[PDB]
Design an enzyme around this catalytic site. Structure first.
Site, PDB file in Angstrom:
ATOM      1  CB  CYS A 174     -10.564  -4.885  14.080  1.00 48.08           C
ATOM      2  SG  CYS A 174     -10.696  -4.706  12.286  1.00 48.08           S
ATOM      3  CD  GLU A 179     -13.596 -10.658  -6.398  1.00 50.48           C
ATOM      4  OE1 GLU A 179     -14.117 -10.102  -7.387  1.00 50.48           O
ATOM      5  OE2 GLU A 179     -12.884 -10.052  -5.571  1.00 50.48           O
ATOM      6  CD  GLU A 222     -12.535 -11.708   1.751  1.00 50.60           C
ATOM      7  OE1 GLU A 222     -12.363 -12.846   2.228  1.00 50.60           O
ATOM      8  OE2 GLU A 222     -11.633 -11.103   1.134  1.00 50.60           O
ATOM      9  CD  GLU A 232      -3.162  -0.745   2.156  1.00 46.47           C
ATOM     10  OE1 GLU A 232      -3.072   0.084   3.085  1.00 46.47           O
ATOM     11  OE2 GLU A 232      -3.904  -1.749   2.212  1.00 46.47           O
ATOM     12  CB  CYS A 267      -7.992  -2.932   5.750  1.00 45.46           C
ATOM     13  SG  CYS A 267      -6.394  -2.392   5.107  1.00 45.46           S
ATOM     14  CB  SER A 303      -6.352   0.489  -2.460  1.00 45.43           C
ATOM     15  OG  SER A 303      -5.153  -0.249  -2.602  1.00 45.43           O
ATOM     16  CD  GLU A 355      -0.907  -0.090  -5.942  1.00 46.78           C
ATOM     17  OE1 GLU A 355      -0.925   0.940  -6.648  1.00 46.78           O
ATOM     18  OE2 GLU A 355      -1.179  -1.220  -6.399  1.00 46.78           O
ATOM     19  CE  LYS A 403     -11.145  -9.579   7.420  1.00 46.60           C
ATOM     20  NZ  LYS A 403     -10.266  -9.163   6.295  1.00 46.60           N
TER      21      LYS A 403
HETATM   22  S1  SF4 Z   1     -14.236  -6.412  12.681  1.00 49.37           S
HETATM   23 FE1  SF4 Z   1     -15.446  -4.657  11.880  1.00 49.37          FE
HETATM   24  S2  SF4 Z   1     -13.870  -3.139  11.246  1.00 49.37           S
HETATM   25 FE2  SF4 Z   1     -12.778  -5.120  11.496  1.00 49.37          FE
HETATM   26  S3  SF4 Z   1     -12.798  -6.036   9.411  1.00 49.37           S
HETATM   27 FE3  SF4 Z   1     -14.631  -6.860  10.484  1.00 49.37          FE
HETATM   28  S4  SF4 Z   1     -16.299  -5.423   9.914  1.00 49.37           S
HETATM   29 FE4  SF4 Z   1     -14.351  -4.370   9.391  1.00 49.37          FE
END
Ligand code: SF4
Ligand code: SF4
Ligand code: SF4
Ligand code: SF4
Ligand code: SF4
Ligand code: SF4
Ligand code: SF4
Ligand code: SF4
Ligand code: FES
Ligand code: FES
Lengths: 571, 571
Positions: B500, B365, B360, B278, B298, B318, B281, B357
């Site tokens: 987080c 992809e 995700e 990053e 992120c 990004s 970049e 996550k």
């Molecule tokens: S815990 Fe909250 S801020 Fe951290 S990656 Fe997951 S959604 Fe995003």
């Protein structure tokens, strides 16, 4: 000495020969779950949930397999976890799931293991246990929640040597009960309360008098006075996250005052009065030299055992009342006329760690001096119910005029403490002087031995002192006394093993060494008090010279003493 | 400042005017129960369980009652307790009582309040709630245990401004729903997980995949690598009775080693990979001066919020992957060829505190780089499942050669710590020197403000930087950018309020000031390390010089880059 090498999880372990895999894996930073095991009982192997696999490929129980040299075992293998998950699914497939309504909620071991092993969807659905509940007095038994671990029968047969309950039927419908499904009161039970303390589910619990307390407090024409036992202040703090052995007297006094109770007193005053009466009776008996041996009657389970199994010892036991009934008589007879409150409008509430007191309160011989009886768990439920934060309270003192205490009455929660108080007062009442220094403490009657014998010398005269904790040890002393091997003078029995610190009302614990911690707590409590003698109290003297004018008087014989009748009906 | 004189339960209270009668009584060592109230939400008054009694004699709610001069109140009157008991009986009369299967077991607030208020026999038995469970992805919704507190709707309304779910129907049959009961994937949700964190029952939970992990472990030919997140190291100890903010890195590494995982790694290595990429970049974008401002990638929830609501900002984002997917690609591309294992035979597990996550991980992809993901609560449940005692473990380090890390990658669990990890590297790469002394730390990007702004001067060149925590503040800052008032250069967005450390996977806590303790723990962890710079890591340079030879190369563009496509379906 012989040492044993083994491997656990690829780690070298040195263990003494003869211990089981569960006991050997304590120092390795690992713990195998199990329901049928306790530190005071023999292994039974009924849960089959503590299984681990050896090198061959089969699973063996880890609670009754001795460690043999040169084996490798695994604990986190997938097969073991699969077996444990299936076993808990089988257990939970026939359990009535009213976890809102269970008295053992948030303390049930089965619930903790159901959470811990990640159960989310039970595929086995079908027939459930469906029995009918009945009252039994102070013990509330619900056979819908039993898992047949066998802890209750083992603690009632191997330790207590009473054999009041046992298994019945066969197969899926097996259940633990008395002969012919009769109530516990007319069975061979003595209401020691040990079976309540070890039950890992909510099958065995306590009858509650909570609603009567709330209706009594809600009535504006009733004045409420509450007493606490000496053994509650040392173990009450376990519910709130403190280690056992913390002194929380002031915090619990503040909590009781904020709970709505009008007056808060303590049993230690009535305990000192009981000590005075007992030592007067002992002095009189020793002067006459009759009815040897002489037994103490401070334990309701012991007096039930005498009335049920050994009716021949009735002339040899003391007639002194329990301290609870002594305080009830004082509150209903002397304090009421002083304050100016009618006897019919006075409510007396007790907090005791025993379960025999709950049955003892409703005996018709005592004229209902104590109306309702609580336990330590019920008081700990009150504090959380009313929102009082126990950690940050301000310590206060007891009320007047019978709240002040002495150090002689602070050790009733230990086995043999009554004996130490009796010797402390008897030395002064015989020799005429007062013990000073290390001679106050009698170290010969301290410890956790099953049988405690002492040969106590006072001014050249030697007396025999015998202490037995546990009903089985009391039976052994009874067999020895009836055999005529030796003669004693003054003998104490407590049905619970280790004294009142291990009664059925105390909070549940998992540490294997809670007894030592609680003994240290009680002794450190006793060592922190300026007065260490029962007769040195002033308020006991004021009560005597105000109302009765003499210990063991006609009024005292009328109010401070009772008589027992044999319950051993012939067949 | 104007103070108000009152009495609460017979105790004088001094508090500022404007506080409620529940929030101003917490500092008297008394706390009244309530389910509809949280410290981050406006009062709503749907529980009606926090009622008290004033002087007049009618029950008044407390969570939305401002206090004025001259009231006497009591929170332990029998009438209030009876009303609370009846209200909880009414709640539990229509609750499906499978507390063995509930994911929220031993942490449900309804269970604790059912234990505290001494409920023993439900008299109101009747029609229960009977709905059907549907699947939604990483959020498991069961509208059979809902108490209709409204916390999820308010936290998706008042704070997030996402408006994903809302009430539906009326009367006894009302529930919480998306439009037309569509799955949450197709609705306007962005998968932030805040509604999971505040639910006081088991209605909203996680789709747990411990099973797939177990047959991954049990397969004798599969090799398992597990990675740990920076924000897990400061919150796991709360699951074991420790004070929050205790550094438990060695203990959790030992626990993961004993759990059967073949290799354990930290994701701080891939985090430093992301930082250096990053920074390259950002230097490139500064040199060309195009596509400003540029947004970080992120946070998966931020990416979803852009792809659903703001599809016009796609060219300005990004293209760097999240650190989890970069570590997955590294493990399945470079490490596999080094050890000598097939790509299909490697199993990568992640322990991250976020809920987005989980979604995700299964995007088509990403070519299925990672196979399964976890959160901290499941890790703690596994640790307690295998029987490992967390208190008495021994500290041990990470594996090789992806174990060691730097101080720049240990502050990702704080709002602002990502760009604070990139400014040092940008300073080093553009100026040519390294910061020394206290100039390493940037004090302008630390705190908990909604929108943080800074103007950083580096060698006479000024850059404007901004931080937005919470999607509401992100929307406000996007509105400010589209207004064209001022121009930025590098913008960070984290969906959860506070970074987080406040994700949906973190353990449940009741302390109102957990964020300060977690920030202090993170900063203490950062300051307790010898290396504080991402560029000074060795194995990052080794990986480039053996496999890529240059950052932002064609191989890196092939493996460490992805493209985003709009999801705003035209209506
Ligand atoms: S815990 Fe909250 S801020 Fe951290 S990656 Fe997951 S959604 Fe995003
Ligand atoms: S109270 Fe004691 S004697 Fe009675 S059944 Fe239980 S363990 Fe046996
Ligand atoms: S009654 Fe209690 S102690 Fe006895 S077998 Fe059943 S669960 Fe175990
Ligand atoms: S015994 Fe335990 S699992 Fe069974 S209903 Fe009671 S609390 Fe729940
Ligand atoms: S020893 Fe104490 S707790 Fe046990 S039965 Fe006797 S009085 Fe009750
Ligand atoms: S939400 Fe709470 S009360 Fe309801 S089933 Fe789950 S644990 Fe029990
Ligand atoms: S995950 Fe976030 S956006 Fe989705 S419903 Fe819950 S609070 Fe709203
Ligand atoms: S889903 Fe949970 S947070 Fe939302 S209303 Fe129901 S109980 Fe409350
Ligand atoms: S408790 Fe150990 S085998 Fe059953
Ligand atoms: S939960 Fe507090 S007033 Fe409703």
């Amino acid at each position: 000495m012989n040492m044993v090498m083994l491997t656990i999880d690829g780690k070298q372990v040195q263990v003494e020969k003869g211990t089981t895999i569960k006991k050997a894996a304590e120092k390795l930073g690992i713990e195998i779950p199990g329901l049928c095991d306790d530190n005071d009982l023999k292994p039974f192997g009924a849960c089959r949930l503590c299984v681990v696999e050896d090198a061959r490929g089969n699973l063996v129980a880890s609670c009754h397999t001795p460690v043999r040299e040169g084996m490798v075992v695994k604990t986190n293998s997938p097969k073991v976890l699969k077996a444990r998950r299936v076993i808990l699914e089988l257990l939970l497939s026939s359990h009535n799931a009213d976890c809102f309504e269970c008295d053992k909620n948030l303390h049930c071991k089965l619930q903790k293991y159901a959470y811990e092993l990640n159960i989310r969807n039970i595929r086995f659905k079908g027939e459930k246990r469906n029995y009918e509940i009945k009252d039994n007095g102070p013990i509330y038994y619900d056979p819908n929640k039993c898992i047949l671990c066998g802890k209750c029968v083992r603690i009632c047969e191997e330790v207590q040597h009473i054999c009041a309950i046992d298994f019945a039927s066969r197969g899926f419908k097996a259940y633990i009960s008395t002969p012919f499904e009769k109530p516990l009161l007319e069975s061979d039970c003595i209401f020691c309360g040990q079976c309540v303390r070890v039950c890992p589910t909510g099958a065995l619990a306590e009858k509650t008098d909570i609603e009567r307390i709330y209706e009594a407090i809600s009535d504006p024409n009733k004045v409420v006075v509450v007493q606490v036992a000496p053994a509650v202040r040392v173990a009450l703090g376990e519910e709130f996250g403190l280690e056992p052995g913390e002194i929380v007297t002031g915090k619990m006094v503040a909590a009781l005052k904020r709970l709505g109770f009008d007056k808060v007193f303590d049993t230690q005053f009535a305990a000192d009065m009981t000590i005075v009466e007992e030592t007067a009776e002992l002095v009189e008996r020793l002067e006459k030299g009759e009815n040897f041996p002489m037994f103490t009657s401070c334990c309701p389970s012991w007096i039930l055992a005498v009335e049920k199994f050994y009716p021949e010892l009735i002339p040899n036991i003391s007639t002194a009342r329990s301290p609870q009934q002594i305080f009830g008589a004082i509150a209903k007879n002397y304090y009421a006329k002083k304050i100016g409150v009618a006897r019919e409008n006075m409510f007396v509430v007790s907090v005791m760690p025993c379960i025999g007191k709950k049955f003892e309160a409703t005996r018709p011989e005592f004229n209902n001096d104590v109306d309702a009886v609580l336990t330590t768990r019920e008081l700990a439920r009150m504090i959380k119910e009313s929102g009082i934060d126990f950690i940050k309270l301000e310590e206060e003192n007891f009320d007047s005029p019978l709240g002040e205490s002495t150090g002689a009455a602070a050790i009733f929660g230990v086995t043999g403490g009554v004996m130490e108080a009796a010797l402390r007062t008897a030395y002064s009442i015989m020799t005429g002087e007062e013990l000073e220094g290390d001679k106050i403490e009698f170290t010969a009657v301290r410890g956790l031995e099953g049988i405690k014998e002492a040969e106590v010398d006072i001014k050249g005269k030697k007396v025999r002192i015998a202490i037995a904790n546990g009903i089985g040890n009391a039976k052994k002393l009874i067999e020895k006394i009836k055999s005529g091997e030796t003669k004693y003078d003054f003998v104490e029995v407590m049905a619970c093993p280790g004294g009142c610190m291990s009664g059925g009302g105390q909070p549940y614990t998992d540490d294997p060494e809670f007894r030592k911690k609680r003994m240290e707590g009680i002794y450190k409590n006793d060592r922190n008090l300026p007065k260490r003698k029962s007769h040195e109290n002033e308020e006991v003297k004021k009560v005597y010279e105000e109302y009765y004018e003499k210990p063991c008087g006609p009024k005292a014989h009328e109010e401070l003493h009772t008589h027992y009748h044999s319950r051993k009906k012939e067949y």
